[PDB]
Amino acid sequence: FEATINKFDKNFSAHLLDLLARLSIYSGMASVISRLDFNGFYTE
Amino acid sequence: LGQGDFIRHLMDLLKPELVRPATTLYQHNLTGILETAVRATNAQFDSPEILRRLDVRLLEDTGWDVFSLDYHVDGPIATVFTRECMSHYLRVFNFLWRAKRMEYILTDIR
Amino acid sequence: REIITLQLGQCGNQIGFEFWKQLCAEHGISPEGIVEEFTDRKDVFFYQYIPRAVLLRVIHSILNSPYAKLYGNNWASGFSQGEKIHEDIFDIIDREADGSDSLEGFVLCHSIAGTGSGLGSYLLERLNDRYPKKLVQTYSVFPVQPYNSLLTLKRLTQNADCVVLDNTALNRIATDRLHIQSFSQINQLVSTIMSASTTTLRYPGYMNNDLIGLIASLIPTPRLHFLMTGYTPLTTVLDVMRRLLQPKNVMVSNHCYIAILNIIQGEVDPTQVHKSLQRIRERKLANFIPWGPASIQVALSRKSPYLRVSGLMMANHTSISSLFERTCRQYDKLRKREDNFDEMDTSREIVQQLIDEYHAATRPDYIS
Amino acid sequence: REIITLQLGQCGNQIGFEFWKQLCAEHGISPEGIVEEFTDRKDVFFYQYIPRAVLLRVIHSILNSPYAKLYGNNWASGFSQGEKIHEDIFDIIDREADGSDSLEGFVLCHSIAGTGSGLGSYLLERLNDRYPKKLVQTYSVFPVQPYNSLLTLKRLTQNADCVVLDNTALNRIATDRLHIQSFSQINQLVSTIMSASTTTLRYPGYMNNDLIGLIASLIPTPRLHFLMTGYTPLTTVLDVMRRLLQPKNVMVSNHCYIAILNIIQGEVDPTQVHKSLQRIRERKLANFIPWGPASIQVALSRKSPYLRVSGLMMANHTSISSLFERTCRQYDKLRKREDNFDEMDTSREIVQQLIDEYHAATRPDYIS
């Protein structure tokens, strides 16, 4: 248990950086990033 | 650049961005900055229709070499501009953009 | 789901009675508990109509009012007397909880300043022990006074699962824009916030249809469970959203937010809401925690037809720690000025943990 | 960008109050700070509307006027009292600066003749120390009087980043073409210049859209930062451009210009402007510095519809050194007529440097 919680973090955070990646390449669909992030987080 | 009040604020917000090389520049980020300028300056009190067409385009270095506004126009009004006035305004907008950053540099030194 | 409200002490009964008076008018319910002729969900608070209330001298003022058809000063004395009537008062709640369809919570209205301070701390311990799956939201009100103020703070930091309303910010707003110079005049302002706090549980909305929906959104960690309120109109959504972030309206006497909830009770335009949030991000009027991704939430609502644009703000601000130091500092000054007296320092110990918990929450490495 | 104005002393508050009265009428803003029905940029000076003012007995005259809804005699006493309330008055400015979107400057309206002389010199030192990137433009007004006049001159030559208005030239113009023989009558003339000085910051123009644009154009070197004003109409642009160079209009009691800025607030023809400048070069009505290439600038503007051809001239003339010698000479006469008294000669020393700086500016080898 103590060793699998950290696995989900590396697994779930990897998919989220994929969602924020594709949701950025667009011409709404651009204001979603301002709904996912507010603090400048996920800036990588 | 006939507004002056709006382009002043717009040159203060693009300063932290355009200093980076063009490879790290993506259009989807600048629109939030442009939208912020139109809200803060006096350009907010304006017809919503004409504000729907004013956007950004990325010419294809440094961020001060690929940024320019477009103001695309389609429909019946597009018979007055005819894709050549829009290929001439951008030919002008560069000379008014350079002669505007060469001045805000010289008022920063001062 | 249902919610049973408990009112303790003189402060509880009055601000509770003014809470029911405002709600009974919002709905088409006459003071004699009969529906008037003249879509709003009224089953959560009213039992088919009778309010789900448990009142605990001031009672006679309520029984003589036209609303009769609707139903010491030491903290140790308040805690002791609750121990003696444990089975008596727990017999009216048990039937109130059982008789209910599917109980959800236990709203508590009390002030930490004499019997409601003690008897309130006593019920808060028994409630969690009797039911561990029932949320306990407490509308506490801040004012031997320093002692009783922090003693309940010890119970409110481990028992209560979730709103402070301090009389100091109530007095300042009263003299500023209301010109009162009176208890019956400040109560009109708090009850306006309470009836607006649960405006997303009396009308079927898209989101926040349960009491656990309003709580789990703001509170990130079970220790940081103190929230503050903001209520501007005493027009576009940008005007309201900007006026709420003014410290002249926040009812609280580095620092940053953890999560904000905005309640718009008007007929405003539903597409301009994203436009206002965009300009908030540009001008940077609010700063948040650096560690976790925090956002701001805004929800619309519909005013009752039987009973203009308003707005309320629910946020979890780290500046609330400042209020605790004021209570904490005054205690130590009294501890050097005067069976075992060991219950106090244990309370003094646990409250200091929360204060350090807050000051460590505003660091980029709050984790561990 | 925004600009916060500070008003010190009796002279500041009045000419400041007359400044806001003229501006509130220029815009569609009623005296009770409500927009009247009846394109002009009003965000720089007004906060969404309320003026960004910091006023510092005369205050009661303002509070009793219909505009209430819009908000010793020794220099040592003025400097001392500012030291005692340093944190108090700096608490209303900090919030005024922070609360602002992106602060740009600090317009200061005061006269160097008693408390505004000292308290003005005190804030001028603190302002630069607290913020080094904020421009401080001061609309000083020239009149134990010789002492206090040059003491602030010491502070105005190193702190202020940029306009003199001398009462002597105000009295002469008053008796000449206005027939006054009164403070309330000369103030109508200065406020007409102030509201016209920033006529390129209230309307979106092609150039001079920022406060640093008006300053850096005229001031070539941070020591030579004293400007004078000219305002003719108390018709083609050639008539206005010629009447402004008449010494009968310049508000100042070899010598040459360094840079001139002309403000035309009319509906004049935009193609004839170059024709007027051409005839100015031929007749040679103005002479400039021989060392650096200096030109004359003229800018058009649009009068408010809610509120004819006017014209204002902003120029950096070396003749302003003459005014300083008058203040300097009177001091030495008082120094022979009566803890350490060493602060005065240091001020006397630094002001003499500026005077020699001016007289060396009109030589073909001013460099080094």
Short mmCIF file of C-alpha atoms in Angstrom, two decimals, chain C residues 41-353:
data_model
loop_
_atom_site.label_atom_id
_atom_site.label_comp_id
_atom_site.label_asym_id
_atom_site.label_seq_id
_atom_site.Cartn_x
_atom_site.Cartn_y
_atom_site.Cartn_z
CA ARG C 41 -36.40 22.15 -2.92
CA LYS C 42 -37.70 22.46 0.64
CA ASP C 43 -37.45 18.85 1.85
CA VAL C 44 -33.86 19.17 3.09
CA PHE C 45 -34.69 21.63 5.86
CA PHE C 46 -38.46 21.25 6.28
CA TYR C 47 -40.32 18.07 7.23
CA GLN C 48 -43.69 17.43 5.59
CA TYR C 49 -44.20 21.89 6.76
CA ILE C 50 -42.12 21.98 9.95
CA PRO C 51 -38.46 23.01 10.37
CA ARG C 52 -36.01 20.35 11.51
CA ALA C 53 -34.78 22.40 14.45
CA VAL C 54 -33.61 21.52 17.97
CA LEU C 55 -33.61 24.60 20.18
CA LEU C 56 -31.59 24.64 23.40
CA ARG C 57 -35.38 32.25 29.01
CA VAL C 58 -34.88 33.35 25.41
CA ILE C 59 -37.17 30.48 24.39
CA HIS C 60 -40.13 32.40 25.83
CA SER C 61 -39.48 35.31 23.47
CA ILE C 62 -39.82 32.84 20.60
CA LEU C 63 -42.99 31.27 22.01
CA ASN C 64 -44.69 34.67 22.37
CA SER C 65 -43.73 35.87 18.88
CA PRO C 66 -46.09 35.27 15.92
CA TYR C 67 -43.86 32.29 15.01
CA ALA C 68 -45.11 30.05 17.82
CA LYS C 69 -46.71 27.65 15.32
CA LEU C 70 -43.35 26.70 13.78
CA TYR C 71 -42.05 24.07 16.24
CA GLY C 72 -23.49 30.18 34.25
CA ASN C 73 -20.70 31.93 32.35
CA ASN C 74 -17.87 29.44 32.99
CA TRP C 75 -17.00 26.91 30.31
CA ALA C 76 -16.77 24.23 33.00
CA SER C 77 -20.37 24.85 34.06
CA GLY C 78 -21.43 24.50 30.43
CA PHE C 79 -19.52 21.24 30.05
CA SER C 80 -20.76 19.86 33.37
CA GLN C 81 -24.48 20.47 32.86
CA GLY C 82 -24.37 18.75 29.47
CA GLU C 83 -22.99 15.63 31.15
CA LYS C 84 -26.01 15.49 33.48
CA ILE C 85 -28.69 15.65 30.77
CA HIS C 86 -26.78 13.48 28.30
CA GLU C 87 -29.59 10.97 27.83
CA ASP C 88 -32.36 13.59 27.91
CA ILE C 89 -31.26 15.83 25.04
CA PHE C 90 -29.89 12.81 23.12
CA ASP C 91 -33.45 11.33 23.11
CA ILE C 92 -34.96 14.20 21.03
CA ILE C 93 -32.04 14.02 18.50
CA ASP C 94 -32.08 10.18 18.14
CA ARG C 95 -35.78 10.27 17.08
CA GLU C 96 -35.02 13.38 14.93
CA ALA C 97 -32.15 11.45 13.23
CA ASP C 98 -33.98 8.07 12.96
CA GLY C 99 -37.35 9.53 11.89
CA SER C 100 -35.40 11.22 9.10
CA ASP C 101 -35.28 9.56 5.69
CA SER C 102 -31.48 9.51 5.26
CA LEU C 103 -29.63 11.90 7.55
CA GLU C 104 -26.73 13.85 6.08
CA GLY C 105 -25.44 16.43 8.54
CA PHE C 106 -25.66 18.46 11.77
CA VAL C 107 -25.58 22.25 11.26
CA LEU C 108 -24.61 23.97 14.52
CA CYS C 109 -25.21 27.65 15.28
CA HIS C 110 -23.40 28.95 18.36
CA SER C 111 -20.91 31.53 19.62
CA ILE C 112 -17.65 30.50 21.28
CA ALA C 113 -17.76 33.31 23.86
CA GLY C 114 -21.07 31.20 28.05
CA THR C 115 -23.10 28.00 28.21
CA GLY C 116 -23.23 27.60 24.43
CA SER C 117 -19.44 27.57 24.60
CA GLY C 118 -19.36 24.61 26.99
CA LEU C 119 -22.52 22.71 26.11
CA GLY C 120 -21.50 23.25 22.50
CA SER C 121 -18.09 21.66 23.07
CA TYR C 122 -19.78 18.75 24.83
CA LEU C 123 -22.22 17.87 22.05
CA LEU C 124 -19.42 18.16 19.49
CA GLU C 125 -17.56 15.27 21.13
CA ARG C 126 -20.63 13.08 21.60
CA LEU C 127 -21.88 13.62 18.01
CA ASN C 128 -18.66 12.31 16.35
CA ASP C 129 -18.54 9.32 18.76
CA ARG C 130 -22.24 8.41 18.14
CA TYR C 131 -22.03 8.91 14.31
CA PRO C 132 -18.68 8.99 12.38
CA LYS C 133 -20.28 9.29 8.88
CA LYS C 134 -22.29 12.48 9.68
CA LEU C 135 -20.84 15.89 8.71
CA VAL C 136 -20.91 18.57 11.40
CA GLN C 137 -20.83 22.11 10.02
CA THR C 138 -20.69 24.83 12.65
CA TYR C 139 -21.57 28.49 12.07
CA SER C 140 -19.44 29.69 14.97
CA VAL C 141 -19.34 33.39 15.87
CA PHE C 142 -16.27 35.01 17.35
CA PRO C 143 -16.45 37.76 20.01
CA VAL C 144 -12.62 34.65 31.52
CA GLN C 145 -13.50 35.34 27.90
CA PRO C 146 -10.05 34.39 26.48
CA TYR C 147 -10.19 31.02 28.25
CA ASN C 148 -13.57 29.87 26.94
CA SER C 149 -12.71 31.15 23.46
CA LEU C 150 -9.78 28.79 22.94
CA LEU C 151 -11.22 25.81 24.83
CA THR C 152 -13.90 25.31 22.19
CA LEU C 153 -11.22 25.95 19.59
CA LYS C 154 -9.63 22.71 20.78
CA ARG C 155 -12.87 20.85 20.03
CA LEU C 156 -13.54 22.67 16.76
CA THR C 157 -10.18 21.61 15.31
CA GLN C 158 -10.69 17.84 15.54
CA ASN C 159 -14.46 17.26 15.75
CA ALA C 160 -16.11 19.73 13.37
CA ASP C 161 -15.76 18.68 9.73
CA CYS C 162 -16.17 22.29 8.57
CA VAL C 163 -17.59 29.10 8.97
CA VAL C 164 -16.39 31.94 11.16
CA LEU C 165 -18.37 35.16 11.56
CA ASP C 166 -16.58 37.60 13.85
CA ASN C 167 -18.52 40.36 15.62
CA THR C 168 -15.63 42.81 15.26
CA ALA C 169 -15.98 42.87 11.47
CA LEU C 170 -19.73 42.96 12.12
CA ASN C 171 -19.42 46.10 14.24
CA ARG C 172 -17.13 47.84 11.74
CA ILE C 173 -19.45 47.21 8.78
CA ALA C 174 -22.41 48.24 10.94
CA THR C 175 -21.02 51.69 11.75
CA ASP C 176 -19.52 52.19 8.28
CA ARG C 177 -22.40 51.76 5.81
CA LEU C 178 -25.39 51.02 8.08
CA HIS C 179 -25.04 53.74 10.77
CA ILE C 180 -26.14 51.86 13.88
CA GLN C 181 -24.40 54.24 16.31
CA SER C 182 -27.54 46.74 18.67
CA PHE C 183 -27.94 42.97 18.50
CA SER C 184 -31.17 42.96 16.49
CA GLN C 185 -29.49 44.97 13.71
CA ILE C 186 -26.32 42.93 13.20
CA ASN C 187 -28.38 39.72 13.09
CA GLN C 188 -30.03 40.97 9.90
CA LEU C 189 -26.59 40.83 8.29
CA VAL C 190 -25.48 37.37 9.43
CA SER C 191 -28.78 35.71 8.53
CA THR C 192 -28.40 37.19 5.05
CA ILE C 193 -25.16 35.21 4.75
CA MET C 194 -26.53 31.95 6.17
CA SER C 195 -29.57 31.86 3.89
CA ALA C 196 -27.12 32.60 1.08
CA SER C 197 -24.57 30.00 2.19
CA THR C 198 -26.94 27.09 1.44
CA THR C 199 -28.50 28.61 -1.71
CA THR C 200 -27.17 25.54 -3.63
CA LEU C 201 -29.12 23.02 -1.46
CA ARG C 202 -32.63 24.59 -1.76
CA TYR C 203 -32.64 24.74 -5.62
CA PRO C 204 -31.87 21.73 -7.92
CA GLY C 205 -28.60 22.83 -9.61
CA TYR C 206 -26.08 21.24 -12.03
CA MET C 207 -23.37 20.77 -9.35
CA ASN C 208 -23.11 21.14 -5.50
CA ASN C 209 -26.44 19.32 -4.84
CA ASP C 210 -25.10 17.73 -1.59
CA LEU C 211 -23.58 19.20 1.63
CA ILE C 212 -20.44 17.09 1.08
CA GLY C 213 -20.06 18.84 -2.27
CA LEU C 214 -19.59 22.29 -0.76
CA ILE C 215 -17.19 20.99 1.89
CA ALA C 216 -14.81 18.68 0.05
CA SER C 217 -14.19 21.30 -2.64
CA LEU C 218 -12.68 23.91 -0.32
CA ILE C 219 -11.12 21.89 2.52
CA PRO C 220 -7.96 20.21 1.16
CA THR C 221 -6.80 18.71 4.46
CA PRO C 222 -8.97 17.93 7.51
CA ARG C 223 -6.94 20.30 9.70
CA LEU C 224 -7.44 23.40 7.51
CA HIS C 225 -11.21 23.64 7.93
CA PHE C 226 -11.87 27.33 8.64
CA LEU C 227 -13.62 29.43 6.01
CA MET C 228 -14.60 33.09 5.70
CA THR C 229 -17.44 34.88 3.93
CA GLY C 230 -17.80 37.82 1.56
CA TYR C 231 -21.04 39.57 0.56
CA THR C 232 -20.94 42.74 -1.53
CA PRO C 233 -24.37 44.32 -2.23
CA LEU C 234 -25.46 45.93 1.04
CA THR C 235 -24.18 45.31 -13.49
CA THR C 236 -21.96 42.51 -14.81
CA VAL C 237 -20.34 39.62 -12.99
CA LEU C 238 -16.99 41.39 -13.30
CA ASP C 239 -18.19 44.14 -10.97
CA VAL C 240 -19.33 41.64 -8.33
CA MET C 241 -16.24 39.44 -8.69
CA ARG C 242 -13.98 42.46 -8.17
CA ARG C 243 -15.88 43.92 -5.22
CA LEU C 244 -15.73 40.60 -3.35
CA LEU C 245 -11.93 40.58 -3.29
CA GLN C 246 -11.88 43.95 -1.53
CA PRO C 247 -10.80 43.59 2.12
CA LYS C 248 -13.45 46.20 3.00
CA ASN C 249 -16.08 43.46 2.54
CA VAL C 250 -14.35 40.34 3.88
CA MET C 251 -15.84 39.63 7.31
CA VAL C 252 -12.47 39.00 8.96
CA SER C 253 -10.53 41.44 11.13
CA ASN C 254 3.05 35.36 3.30
CA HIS C 255 -0.71 34.91 2.87
CA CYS C 256 -2.76 33.41 0.05
CA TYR C 257 -5.97 31.54 -0.72
CA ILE C 258 -6.44 27.79 -0.99
CA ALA C 259 -9.77 27.70 -2.85
CA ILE C 260 -12.59 30.17 -3.46
CA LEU C 261 -16.28 29.55 -4.11
CA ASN C 262 -18.37 32.37 -5.59
CA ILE C 263 -22.16 32.31 -5.37
CA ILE C 264 -24.06 34.51 -7.83
CA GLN C 265 -27.76 34.66 -6.97
CA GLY C 266 -28.82 36.83 -9.91
CA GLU C 267 -30.11 36.59 -13.47
CA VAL C 268 -26.67 37.31 -14.91
CA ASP C 269 -25.54 36.30 -18.38
CA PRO C 270 -24.19 32.71 -18.36
CA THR C 271 -21.57 33.23 -21.09
CA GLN C 272 -19.74 36.24 -19.62
CA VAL C 273 -18.67 34.28 -16.54
CA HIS C 274 -15.59 32.87 -18.26
CA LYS C 275 -14.73 36.35 -19.51
CA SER C 276 -14.59 37.74 -15.98
CA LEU C 277 -12.36 34.92 -14.70
CA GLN C 278 -10.00 35.61 -17.60
CA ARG C 279 -9.50 39.24 -16.59
CA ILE C 280 -9.01 38.14 -12.98
CA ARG C 281 -6.07 35.99 -14.08
CA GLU C 282 -4.49 38.90 -15.98
CA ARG C 283 -4.75 41.64 -13.35
CA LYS C 284 -3.76 39.09 -10.67
CA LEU C 285 -6.08 40.24 -7.89
CA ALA C 286 -5.77 36.99 -5.91
CA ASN C 287 -2.83 34.78 -4.99
CA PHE C 288 -3.04 31.11 -4.09
CA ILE C 289 -0.97 28.29 -2.60
CA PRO C 290 2.20 27.39 -4.53
CA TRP C 291 2.22 23.65 -3.79
CA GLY C 292 -1.11 22.27 -5.00
CA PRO C 293 -3.11 23.27 -8.07
CA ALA C 294 -5.88 25.53 -6.77
CA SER C 295 -8.68 27.12 -8.78
CA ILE C 296 -11.65 29.42 -8.17
CA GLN C 297 -15.22 28.17 -8.50
CA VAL C 298 -18.29 30.23 -9.37
CA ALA C 299 -21.86 28.95 -9.29
CA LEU C 300 -25.11 30.58 -10.36
CA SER C 301 -28.51 30.24 -8.64
CA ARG C 302 -32.21 31.26 -8.98
CA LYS C 303 -33.94 33.59 -6.44
CA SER C 304 -37.38 32.47 -5.10
CA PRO C 305 -40.30 34.03 -7.12
CA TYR C 306 -42.39 34.66 -3.93
CA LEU C 307 -39.48 36.60 -2.29
CA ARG C 308 -31.36 42.67 -8.55
CA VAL C 309 -28.02 40.84 -8.47
CA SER C 310 -26.24 39.60 -5.35
CA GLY C 311 -23.09 37.61 -4.68
CA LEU C 312 -21.39 35.60 -1.94
CA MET C 313 -17.83 34.32 -1.64
CA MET C 314 -16.72 31.22 0.27
CA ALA C 315 -12.94 30.90 0.52
CA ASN C 316 -10.31 29.12 2.62
CA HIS C 317 -7.79 31.85 3.42
CA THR C 318 -4.59 31.26 5.38
CA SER C 319 -4.96 34.69 6.99
CA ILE C 320 -7.46 33.12 9.39
CA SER C 321 -4.47 32.04 11.48
CA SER C 322 -4.09 35.67 12.58
CA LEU C 323 -7.36 35.49 14.51
CA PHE C 324 -6.08 32.51 16.49
CA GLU C 325 -2.90 34.27 17.61
CA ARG C 326 -5.04 37.05 19.07
CA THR C 327 -6.92 34.48 21.14
CA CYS C 328 -3.70 32.58 21.87
CA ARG C 329 -1.69 35.64 22.92
CA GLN C 330 -4.37 36.93 25.29
CA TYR C 331 -4.42 33.56 27.07
CA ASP C 332 -0.73 33.58 28.01
CA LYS C 333 -1.14 37.09 29.43
CA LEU C 334 -3.97 35.74 31.61
CA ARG C 335 -2.03 32.60 32.56
CA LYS C 336 0.52 34.74 34.44
CA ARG C 337 -2.16 36.95 36.02
CA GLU C 338 -4.61 34.30 37.34
CA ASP C 339 -8.51 20.25 40.47
CA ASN C 340 -5.48 19.92 38.19
CA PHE C 341 -6.03 22.63 35.52
CA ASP C 342 -4.32 20.41 32.95
CA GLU C 343 -7.16 20.48 30.40
CA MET C 344 -6.22 24.03 29.41
CA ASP C 345 -2.60 23.54 28.37
CA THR C 346 -3.59 20.49 26.33
CA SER C 347 -6.02 22.76 24.50
CA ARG C 348 -3.30 25.41 24.33
CA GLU C 349 -0.96 22.79 22.88
CA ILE C 350 -3.27 21.57 20.12
CA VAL C 351 -4.28 25.05 18.95
CA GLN C 352 -0.63 26.01 18.49
CA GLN C 353 -0.26 23.02 16.18
#
